[PDB]
Amino acid sequence: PRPRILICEDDPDIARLLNLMLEKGGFDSDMVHSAAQALEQVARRPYAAMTVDLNLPDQDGVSLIRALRRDSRTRDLAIVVVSANAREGELEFNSQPLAVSTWLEKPIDENLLILSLHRAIDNMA
């Protein structure tokens, strides 16, 4: 519908699942499959938030998030991690500078996903 989410996910099936779940929750979204694509695409247009897979091919998810926080135009972009090793990733790298609103595991809790994005967007705003 309106607020647009940038989905960065390595797995085609999961990228499409997120695209479809987000639509049910009132969100438009774009799917990309790598950190490089995410960096390029995030600048091409306004995004309310990004979902990040920790296990990416090129650069891993935390590397992508760090890069985004070091750029003024994406320092306030709400980010939600959706990954298989989300919990251990959070325990190891989470920090205020990283500013990741929520770390979600797979299988994905749809309700928590939509709730978390709404929360993340409003808190960053």
Side-chain angles (χ1 to χ4, degrees):
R2 209 57 205 298
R4 186 174 283 246
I5 306 301
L6 174 65
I7 303 172
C8 177
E9 166 65 59
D10 178 65
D11 191 314
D13 287 333
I14 306 302
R16 180 57 167 152
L17 174 64
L18 286 168
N19 180 237
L20 294 166
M21 290 183 171
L22 288 188
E23 178 174 56
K24 289 297 192 185
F27 294 107
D28 281 326
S29 64
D30 287 326
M31 310 173 277
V32 294
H33 60 78
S34 79
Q37 287 198 321
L39 289 172
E40 186 190 320
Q41 191 54 43
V42 75
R44 300 182 63 197
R45 67 184 297 174
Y47 284 109
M50 173 173 184
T51 66
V52 179
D53 176 10
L54 246 48
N55 302 295
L56 305 171
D58 50 11
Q59 311 168 53
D60 49 59
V62 178
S63 168
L64 169 49
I65 296 174
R66 285 186 184 302
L68 291 162
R69 294 320 189 206
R70 294 174 67 258
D71 189 311
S72 68
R73 59 196 184 192
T74 55
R75 186 180 67 73
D76 298 306
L77 174 67
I79 298 188
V80 171
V81 166
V82 182
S83 187
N85 315 82
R87 187 177 174 180
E88 42 267 70
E90 175 177 15
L91 181 64
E92 199 174 320
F93 306 109
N94 204 27
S95 77
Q96 292 304 168
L98 210 61
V100 33
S101 301
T102 324
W103 300 69
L104 301 186
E105 294 182 300
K106 288 174 185 175
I108 310 170
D109 185 318
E110 199 168 338
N111 297 296
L112 187 55
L113 171 64
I114 309 302
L115 177 59
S116 293
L117 284 163
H118 279 152
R119 252 66 178 298
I121 296 177
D122 299 326
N123 171 80
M124 216 79 21

